[PDB]
Subunit: 110 residues, 2 copies
């Protein structure tokens, strides 16, 4: 029915040889998938993330801090000019920085 058509188009947003996906014992996608020398991170549905692919190596997949940082930075691009919305700071290994600050107020964080 036409409701099924609407579900099929909605599912098809972001859709695409001898690649063999790697699965876990529980039947879920292993979050690192590799073929022909490349490796990338995937979500629950096994879709590649935009910046995960790394040649000749195995990527570290995004952490909590890194995902919040990439989410708050896609909303600082809607705020008006000369305005600040909080954006967490993450180390190179994905961890949070010990101190976070916002409108001249600073906290220690876990």
């Amino acid at each position: 029915d036409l409701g099924d058509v609407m579900e099929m188009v909605f599912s098809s947003q972001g859709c695409g040889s001898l690649f063999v996906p790697a699965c876990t014992a529980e039947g879920s996608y292993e979050e690192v998938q590799c073929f022909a020398g490349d490796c990338w991170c995937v979500d629950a549905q096994g879709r590649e993330l935009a910046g995960s692919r790394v040649r000749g190596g195995r990527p570290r997949c995004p952490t909590e801090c890194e995902k919040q940082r990439a989410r708050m930075q896609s909303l600082l691009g809607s705020q008006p000019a000369g305005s600040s919305l909080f954006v967490p700071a993450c180390t190179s290994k994905g961890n949070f920085l010990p101190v976070q600050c916002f409108n001249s107020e600073c906290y220690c964080v876990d």
Copy 2:
């Protein structure tokens, strides 16, 4: 001396891990070089050509027709508008097409 400096800068136009170049019995670069799943064509000095690199495969290196075609097309970009300079036509495998034409005159070619 300052003449040596001029030679070193001139040589350095178009200059750049665990890559091991493959050589021939006569000590010349093998014209296909591969590392970590990629493969590309090289010249006598062992420099990669612009469009040779192919992932997961082994490229066919440019032929006579293909090199003439790429040379005549970098000079049709200096001719005036509405003007024709001859440009050979090559098959997908690099061979010449049986018939070549120019200013309404056609030839069979070897």
